[PDB]
Design a binder for these strands. Structure first.
Ligand SMILES: [Mg+2]
Ligand SMILES: [Mg+2]
Ligand SMILES: [Mg+2]
Ligand SMILES: [Mg+2]
Ligand SMILES: [Mg+2]
Ligand SMILES: [Mg+2]
Ligand SMILES: [Mg+2]
Ligand SMILES: [Mg+2]
Ligand SMILES: [Mg+2]
Ligand SMILES: [Mg+2]
Ligand SMILES: [Mg+2]
Ligand SMILES: [Mg+2]
Ligand SMILES: [Mg+2]
Ligand SMILES: [Mg+2]
Ligand SMILES: [Mg+2]
Ligand SMILES: [Mg+2]
Ligand SMILES: [Mg+2]
Ligand SMILES: [Mg+2]
Ligand SMILES: [Mg+2]
Ligand SMILES: [Mg+2]
Ligand SMILES: [Mg+2]
Ligand SMILES: [Mg+2]
Ligand SMILES: [Zn+2]
Ligand SMILES: [Zn+2]
Lengths: 97, 38, 177, 261, 162, 38
RNA sequence: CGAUGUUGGAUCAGGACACCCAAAUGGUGCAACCGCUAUUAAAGGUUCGUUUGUUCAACGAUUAAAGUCCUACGUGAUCUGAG
RNA sequence: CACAAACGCGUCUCAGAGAUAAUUAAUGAUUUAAUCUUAACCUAAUUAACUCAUAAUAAAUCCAGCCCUAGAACAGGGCACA
C-alpha cells in the first residue's frame, strides 16, 4: 500500500474489484483491495472511485482499472499473488500516464 | 565516503551492502552516512 | 632377449614421444607428469648422467583450467634489469598474451634446477590448440591419461541419466518459477 | 588494384642534397630539405605469409654503384634481375593490393605536394663521445677549485646497490645509427630532376642515402586515397607533369610578390 | 510451476495466472524418517559442486537459488547447496540456466577462462602482488569451507588453500 | 631475555607449542545430527 | 681501531608512497568561484634569488607544483672543504 | 665562425588501439519487494601504469691499396661514369 502511495495514483479514472468471498483462491485479490483502499492511495486523488463487487456465484476473481491514457488494465487474479498484482499495477499504470 | 574499521548505521535509512569483496553502508537520505569497511 | 650389442643398447636408451592433452587441465598437474617424463624418471634405467629423457608434446594449452581464483590472484613477475623494469602480470593477462606461457613456466619450475633443465626444456613442445606439424605427429608413441577427470555440464547428460536421478523434493504447484 | 581504406604504399630511396629556404603566402619562412631520387627500383617481393604474416615486403634499391666492389652473391642477385648494383637496399611493409613487379622504376612523382612523409636514415656519426655531448649532463663548475672534474659524469650510482644499473648513461658511441623523422610535410616536387622538398631537417649527413615513405602517424592515416596508387607510372597517363608541383600555400619562384590588404 | 502471462489487445491488457505440471518427489526414499530433502536421500556430506543433476533441482530457470522455505532444506545444507551452485555457475556448468538476451550473445569477449572450484567472484579479487615468504605466506582459497565435511575417501583432509 | 609476564604475547618454546596443539579441545560429534533426526 | 676517512654543497640520481602538481572520484556547515576533508593512481614533474658553513629557518620574486622520506643522515679510488 | 666543419643563442619533429583502480549505473536471485553482484548471465560509464598495433633493424662469405660527412684500434660507406 505504500509503494502505491509513493507513485501518485492521480492518473487513474476508476478502480473496481470483482471477487467471490467463498472461494479458496481469493485472498490475493482481497490483499489488493485493502492495498488500494488505504488512506494514502485513496487521498492521492479524489477523482478516482473504488468499487468492490461482491458475488457468490461469479467464481472468477478479477481486477479492472481504467486510466486517462484511454487505457484499460484487467488482471484476473486466480493464481496470481498479491505483490505480483501490485508490481504489475505499479509498472503498468505509472510508466503509462 | 569514509574508510572505517567498524561499520554502523547512523540512521534508520542506512542500508548495508557487500560489493567488490567489501562491506559498505549506503544512505540515500544523508549521503554523509556513507561508509566503506577497510 | 637375444640381440646384438649395439641394437640392444640402442633400444634400451631410445627416446620416446608422449602426447598429453591439456584441455580443462590444471597446468600444475600437467607439469607434474610432463616433468617426470622430461627427466626420464619413468625409466627403470634412469640415472642423472644418462641423457635419458623423452619428448613431451602438450596440446590444447589455451584451454588450460585453474582451480579457485588463481586466474586473478596468481602473478607472474619479471624484471628487464633496467631501473623501473619490474613487471608484475596477472595469470589472466599472461595467458591472454601468450597461450603457451603458463604451462611452460610451471614445467620450467618443476624441473631440477641444474644445467640439464635447459636441455630437457628443448624436448618439450607446446601447442596452443590442436595443430601440430605432421613431422611431430609422426613420432608420437602414446598418449598419457589426463590427470583431471573433467565434469560434464548439465547439457551433456543423456535424458536416461536425468530421469534415473531422483527428484529430491516436491515443489508446490502454486509457486512460480 | 583499386584503393582500399587501410592500405599502405611503397616507399623510396632518395639522396639528401642540401637545404633551402622556402616561403608561404601568409609571409612565413620555412626551411626545406631537397631529396633527390636517383635510381630507384623495386628488387624483390616477399609474400605476406613468408615475412611478417601480416604485410608483404618490397625490397627497394638506392643509387647505382660500381660492379667491381661488390660480392659474388650480390652481383648474382642483380645479374638475374638485369639492374646494375644498388648502394643501399631497404625493406618496405606493403598491403598486398599495393604490390609492384620487381624490376620496376620509382620516381619522385610518387609523392604529391601536400602530404606527410617519414624519413629514415643513419644519423651523423659523432664518434666516441663524452657524457656532456652524448647525454647532456651539466659538468661540474670550472673555476672554484674543482680538480680534473669539469666534464666527468659525477656519481654513477648508489652506495647500497653495490653495482651500476644496466641503463646507466655513460660515455660512448654517438650518432651512427638509424633514426626516423615523422610528420614531414612535402611542399614541392621537381619532376625533371626528381627532387622532393620536405619540411625541416632530415636525419643524416648531406649526400647520404635516405628512406622515405608516407607518414604512419595517426592523424594522416587515410591520406593515401588521392595518391597515384600502386605507385606513379610516367608511361600510362600519356600526359607530362609540369616541371614543378607545389602546395597551395607556397609562394612560387615567380609570382605577384605578396601585398597585404 | 505457475506461469504468469501478459497480453496486449486494443488498449486493454490482460494478466493471468496459469498452472503447469510439477514433477514429484521420486517414490521411494532411503531414509523416509529423514527430515530434510538432502538427508532422506542419504546425500549428506556426499554431493559436491560437481554434481549438477542434484543442484539443478533447486534454482530458478534464470539461474538463481530457490528460497529455503519452499525447498525445505536444513539450513546448513541450504548454505552448502548455495555455495555449490555459485561454484558450478562459475565453473561453466549449467549453461542453459543463464538469462536469455538476444543482443549480448553477439559481442564476443576473450574466450572464457576455464576455471573450477572458485570461492569468490572473479571481478572482486585483487591480484596478490606480494606473495610473501615461507613464514608469512599469502594463500589462495580453493573451494569453500562449507564443504570441508564431505567424506574423504583418501583420508587426507581436502586442501582449501593454495 | 623477557620477563615472565609481558605485553606482547611471548612466543613459546616449540615443544610447548606442540603441547598446546595436541591438547586442544575436541567437541563431541554426534553420530547423527539432531536436526536431521525426526 | 694491522683505518668501515665525518657536516653541508656540486654531479648523477635508484627507490618507497604516508600524493605537493598533473588524472579519476565519494562527503560537505559543496549554490557559483574558492576551499576543507576522504578514496584510487607513483609513467612524468617538483623554480630562481638575498643572509647563514650551514641542513633547518626568515625574506624577495615566481610557479601546475615548488611533496614527505629511504638509499653507509645515496654519491670525496668523481669534485668541493666554508664548517 | 681566419679548414670545406663542429656548434646554439638558431631550425625541425613528437602518435593510434586495448587494459584497468576508486566510484557511478542497468537486469536480478539467496531474502518471489528491494539490492551495481567476494550471486549468476550479458552489461554499460570510467585514472595512471602496462601490454600492443605501427615504426626501426633486416642482401652470409670481393676486399690489396686509396678516399670518406665512418672511425681510438678493429670495423663500416665509397673507388664504372665525369
Ligand atoms: Mg664521424
Ligand atoms: Mg659549465
Ligand atoms: Mg684544492
Ligand atoms: Mg691537487
Ligand atoms: Mg682545472
Ligand atoms: Mg648487491
Ligand atoms: Mg630469562
Ligand atoms: Mg675503528
Ligand atoms: Mg684489512
Ligand atoms: Mg629519481
Ligand atoms: Mg595511496
Ligand atoms: Mg589533483
Ligand atoms: Mg617521483
Ligand atoms: Mg641516521
Ligand atoms: Mg653521506
Ligand atoms: Mg661529503
Ligand atoms: Mg681525490
Ligand atoms: Mg666512493
Ligand atoms: Mg525483483
Ligand atoms: Mg534503484
Ligand atoms: Mg612491438
Ligand atoms: Mg667496404
Ligand atoms: Zn543514514
Ligand atoms: Zn538435514
Amino acid at each position: 500500500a505504500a509503494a502505491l502511495a509513493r507513485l501518485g495514483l492521480r492518473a487513474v479514472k476508476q478502480v473496481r474489484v470483482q471477487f467471490c468471498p467463498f472461494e479458496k483462491n481469493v485472498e490475493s485479490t482481497r490483499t489488493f483491495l485493502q492495498a488500494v483502499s488505504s488512506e494514502k492511495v485513496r487521498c492521492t486523488n479524489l477523482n478516482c472511485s473504488v468499487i468492490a463487487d461482491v458475488r457468490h456465484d461469479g467464481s472468477e476473481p478479477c481486477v479492472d482499472v481504467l486510466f486517462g491514457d484511454g487505457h484499460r488494465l484487467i488482471m484476473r487474479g486466480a493464481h496470481l499473488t498479491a505483490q505480483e498484482m501490485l508490481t504489475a499495477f505499479a509498472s503498468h499504470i505509472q510508466a503509462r500516464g | 565516503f569514509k574508510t572505517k574499521g567498524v561499520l554502523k548505521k547512523r540512521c534508520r535509512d542506512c542500508y548495508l551492502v557487500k560489493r567488490r569483496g567489501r562491506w559498505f553502508i549506503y544512505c540515500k537520505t544523508n549521503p554523509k552516512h556513507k561508509q566503506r569497511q577497510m | 632377449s637375444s640381440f646384438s650389442k649395439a641394437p640392444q643398447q640402442w633400444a634400451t636408451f631410445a627416446r620416446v614421444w608422449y602426447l598429453l592433452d591439456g584441455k580443462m587441465q590444471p597446468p600444475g598437474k600437467l607439469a607434474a607428469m610432463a616433468s617426470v617424463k622430461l627427466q626420464g624418471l619413468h625409466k627403470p634405467v634412469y640415472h642423472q648422467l644418462s641423457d635419458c629423457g623423452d619428448h613431451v608434446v602438450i596440446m590444447n594449452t589455451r584451454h588450460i583450467a585453474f582451480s579457485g581464483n588463481k586466474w586473478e590472484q596468481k602473478v607472474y613477475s619479471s624484471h628487464t634489469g633496467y631501473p623501473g623494469g619490474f613487471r608484475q602480470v596477472t595469470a589472466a593477462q599472461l595467458h591472454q598474451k601468450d597461450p603457451v606461457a603458463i604451462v611452460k613456466l610451471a614445467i620450467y619450475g618443476m624441473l631440477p634446477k641444474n644445467l640439464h633443465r635447459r636441455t630437457m626444456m628443448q624436448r618439450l613442445h607446446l601447442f596452443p590448440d590442436e595443430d601440430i606439424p605432421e613431422d611431430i605427429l609422426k613420432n608420437l608413441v602414446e598418449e598419457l591419461p589426463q590427470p583431471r577427470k573433467v565434469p560434464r555440464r548439465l547439457d551433456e547428460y543423456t535424458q536416461e541419466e536425468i530421469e534415473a536421478f531422483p527428484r529430491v523434493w516436491s515443489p508446490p504447484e502454486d509457486y512460480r518459477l | 588494384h583499386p584503393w582500399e581504406p587501410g592500405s599502405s604504399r611503397v616507399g623510396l630511396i632518395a639522396l639528401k642534397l642540401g637545404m633551402m629556404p622556402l616561403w608561404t603566402k601568409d609571409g612565413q619562412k620555412h626551411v626545406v630539405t631537397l631529396l633527390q631520387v636517383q635510381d630507384c627500383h623495386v628488387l624483390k617481393y616477399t609474400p605476406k605469409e613468408n615475412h611478417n604474416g601480416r604485410m608483404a615486403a618490397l625490397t627497394v634499391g638506392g643509387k647505382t654503384v660500381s660492379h667491381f666492389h661488390k660480392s659474388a652473391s650480390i652481383l648474382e642477385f642483380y645479374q638475374e634481375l638485369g639492374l646494375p648494383p644498388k648502394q643501399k637496399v631497404k625493406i618496405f611493409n606493403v598491403t598486398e593490393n599495393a604490390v609492384i613487379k620487381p624490376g620496376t622504376p620509382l620516381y619522385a612523382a610518387h609523392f604529391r605536394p601536400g602530404q606527410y612523409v617519414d624519413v629514415t636514415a643513419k644519423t651523423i656519426g659523432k664518434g666516441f663521445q663524452g657524457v656532456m655531448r652524448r647525454w647532456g649532463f651539466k659538468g661540474q663548475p670550472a673555476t672554484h677549485g674543482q680538480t680534473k672534474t669539469h666534464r666527468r659524469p659525477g656519481a654513477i650510482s648508489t652506495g647500497d646497490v653495490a653495482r651500476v644499473w644496466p641503463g646507466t648513461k655513460m660515455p660512448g658511441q654517438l650518432g651512427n645509427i638509424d633514426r626516423t623523422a615523422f610528420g614531414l610535410k612535402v611542399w614541392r616536387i621537381n619532376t625533371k630532376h626528381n627532387i622532393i622538398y620536405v619540411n625541416g631537417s632530415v636525419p643524416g649527413h648531406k649526400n647520404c642515402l635516405v628512406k622515405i615513405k608516407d607518414s604512419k602517424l595517426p592523424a594522416y592515416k587515410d591520406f593515401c586515397k588521392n595518391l597515384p596508387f600502386p605507385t606513379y607510372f610516367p608511361d600510362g597517363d600519356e600526359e607530362a607533369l609540369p616541371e614543378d608541383l607545389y602546395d597551395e600555400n607556397v609562394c612560387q619562384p615567380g609570382a605577384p610578390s605578396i601585398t597585404f590588404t | 510451476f505457475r506461469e504468469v502471462v501478459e497480453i496486449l489487445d486494443g488498449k486493454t491488457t490482460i494478466i493471468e495466472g496459469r498452472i503447469t505440471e510439477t514433477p514429484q518427489e521420486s517414490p521411494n526414499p532411503p531414509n523416509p524418517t529423514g527430515q530434510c530433502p538432502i538427508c532422506r536421500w542419504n546425500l549428506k556430506h556426499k554431493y559436491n559442486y560437481e554434481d549438477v543433476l542434484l543442484l539443478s533441482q533447486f534454482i530458478r530457470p534464470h539461474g538463481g537459488m530457490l528460497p529455503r522455505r519452499i525447498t525445505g532444506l536444513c539450513q546448513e545444507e541450504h548454505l552448502k547447496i548455495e555455495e555449490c551452485v555459485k561454484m558450478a555457475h562459475r565453473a561453466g556448468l549449467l549453461p542453459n540456466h543463464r538469462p536469455k538476451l538476444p543482443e549480448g550473445f553477439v559481442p564476443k569477449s576473450k574466450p572464457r577462462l576455464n576455471r573450477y572450484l572458485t570461492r569468490w567472484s572473479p571481478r572482486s579479487v585483487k591480484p596478490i602482488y606480494n606473495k610473501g615468504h615461507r613464514w608469512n605466506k599469502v594463500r589462495m582459497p580453493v573451494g569453500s569451507p562449507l564443504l570441508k565435511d564431505n567424506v574423504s575417501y583418501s583420508g587426507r583432509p581436502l586442501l582449501l588453500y593454495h | 631475555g623477557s620477563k615472565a609476564v609481558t605485553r606482547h604475547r611471548r612466543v613459546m618454546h616449540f615443544e610447548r607449542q606442540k603441547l598446546m596443539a595436541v591438547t586442544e579441545y575436541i567437541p563431541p560429534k554426534p553420530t547423527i545430527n539432531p536436526r536431521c533426526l525426526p
